[PDB]
Amino acid sequence: SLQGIHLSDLSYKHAILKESQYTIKRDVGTTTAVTPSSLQQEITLLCGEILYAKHADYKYAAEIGIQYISTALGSERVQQILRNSGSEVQVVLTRTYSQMLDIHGVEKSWVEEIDKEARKTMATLLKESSGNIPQNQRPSAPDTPIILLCVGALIFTKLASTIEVGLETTVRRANRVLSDALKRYPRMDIPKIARSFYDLFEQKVYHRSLFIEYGKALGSSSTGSKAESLFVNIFMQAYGAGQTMLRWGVIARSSNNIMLGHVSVQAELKQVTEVYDLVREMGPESGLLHLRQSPKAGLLSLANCPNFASVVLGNASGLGIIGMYRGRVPNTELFSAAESYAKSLKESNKI
Amino acid sequence: SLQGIHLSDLSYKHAILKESQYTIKRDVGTTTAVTPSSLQQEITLLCGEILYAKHADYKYAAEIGIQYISTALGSERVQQILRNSGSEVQVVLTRTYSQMLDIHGVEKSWVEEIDKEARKTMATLLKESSGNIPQNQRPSAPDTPIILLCVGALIFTKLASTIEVGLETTVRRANRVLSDALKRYPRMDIPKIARSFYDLFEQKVYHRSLFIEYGKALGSSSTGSKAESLFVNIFMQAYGAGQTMLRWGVIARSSNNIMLGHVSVQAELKQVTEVYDLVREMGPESGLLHLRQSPKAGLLSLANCPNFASVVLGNASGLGIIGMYRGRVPNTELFSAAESYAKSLKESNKINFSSLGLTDEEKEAAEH
RNA sequence: CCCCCCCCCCCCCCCCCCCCCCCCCCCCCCCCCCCCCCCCCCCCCCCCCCCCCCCCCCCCCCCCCCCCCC
């Protein structure tokens, strides 16, 4: 008889963020550098120069990476992407001078420093090598911009946490992942390059969705480079951004944690369901919402269900996944219980 | 046999408020300021100036915030929104003089005061800092209008209660929420800024739906600011506006409060159902109805079911949610009963091995 | 390889119909009382609350098929 007492609030909450026929025009005066497709070889060399020598400053390292993306996506197709990201920012086509590159926002002095320092290192090494430097070790190698962007991809994954946390993870993984790249360019300062990328993603927010569009575009192509196929694979491990709680939620169900049967947790079932059903309603873009720093994101918060969150985290702790997750535990009691069951489950073998 | 005795009155009540082919033209002579998109940098600076220094008067602080929304939404797209909100109010495009901003309705004297006072504070501080003030601490920082609007967002949530209640909540939450903004602009007078916003939302009612449209628009964009993503998240916690009773109603069902089974409560079932079914009939706009101060709102009243309301509130009291809710309790008897059950429920720990769907070898180990 | 026999068909008888019988046929207007409807009560609202935070390149073996007869 008592049916009909139900509000699908979360769906309506999302539905309201679609009804906006009006469009936001933020970043009214802003200008960013774009490189035409024609200058892809020149920007490739500059990328290689950053990796090849141990430089004094790695401030614009990230902007150079974005400039390669620019050449790869389109001379002027980039403006379209940026305009469509919600930012009304204007683009500036980078020119040539004497031969060098004049990148908008990038100090001419910095460009010259990077070039000068790299040539100095090439001369020192060519004397030692007895005039013999193979193609794969030169800043001219075509995969050098991809290598640069792969460091950016690693900081892109940890955009969900501290500027600091990301640098740890970036360095650790870069050692295993960019193993061979580091063999050829041992002078690449992963921490400084990764810092330039964090600074860039934080300041030029529109470059987050430009990076996503490069990833999406690269993911589509028939033939990719060995370096390119790595980039996308780093980008994929970045999909469950800020939604670590929902994925650990399915893990709690898969573990059949008896704490998910607790009366207080049972009470939150409808809210939990609503969140997972919103993911399905939003489809594929749902995952990278947090990564884009989208205001829409956060509707996928499990704040409405603290007892469920407690059990999910407990289960993760018991299975030994939790690691360094700072996520607050509302019900300490439920957490400990879920943890105990999961630890007993962990050891036990059944068919 | 006697089943055809049924009137779906509440649906018809709503249906009548759709049949209006005729449209109301209120605010016949009224004029409000709009800022063209071109002046977004100038209004950004002015917003920062409000936060940056401790000012004498924060009267027009809210109107300045609306002016940033104006630049963000559209040079002239704003007039469309206001006209479509039901208000026949006319817009006035704000100009420049010498360089300053001439905002319609905003005293030139006030604009100059805010600017003057901010420059004075910048000079005092630059002497102390030894000429070193980082970008993030200057009134020029691009997130300053968003910060200003976030104080407005907090007062927007508590538009359902007193001008007073809202200020408490705004101040409390602003301290935790705008934590870092306050670090850079410690001179921002949250209570005066929040008061300007309450006054504005109460006087210029059309600005309520303009704020909603900014929120809706911001919620849609691909890349938002850290400040922008906060604004929408404040705006979301504002969705269940004035409908606190219906949401606590679902909580009473989720708690499986045995008082919802009382014969007198059972009698009100059809009215209760009618209200929740009207929410579904109205869809997403249903929630923000009370927030818009829409005359349509109030059809979502649980006045028709006093015994149910009593149980819902009792259950909320027992679970310890009720807090500072002034909502009248018609049946004191039912309330106390629902409260007792909910308090007993609150403490009690039980396990549904029925819900989990485990093997009786996993259900075996669970008993242990 | 396949195929390999035998082999016209038909052939009787036989008109059909033929009786009887018009149908219908009674009765019968309908209507007819009472009766305005309404009548109470009722502004709604009122609490709390930014989210996020772990880890993780993938890949890595081996392999022509076919092969008779008719």
Numbering used by the authors:
A (entry chain H): 2 to 99, 112 to 364
B (entry chain G): 2 to 99, 112 to 381
Would you copy out the relevant sentences from the publication that reported this structure?
HMPV (Paramyxoviridae, subfamily Pneumovirinae) is a leading cause of serious respiratory tract infections in children, the elderly, and immunocompromised individuals. In all members of the Mononegavirales, the RNA genome is packaged in the form of a nucleocapsid, a ribonucleoprotein complex consisting of polymerized viral nucleoproteins (N) and RNA. Besides protecting the viral genome from host nucleases, the nucleocapsid serves as the template for transcription by the viral RNA-dependent RNA polymerase L. Nucleocapsid assembly necessitates a pool of monomeric, RNA-free N, termed N0, which is kept in an unassembled state through an interaction with an N-terminal portion of the polymerase cofactor P, until delivered to the sites of viral RNA synthesis. In conclusion, the reported structures of a paramyxoviral N protein reveal two distinct conformational states, N bound either to the polymerase cofactor P or to RNA.
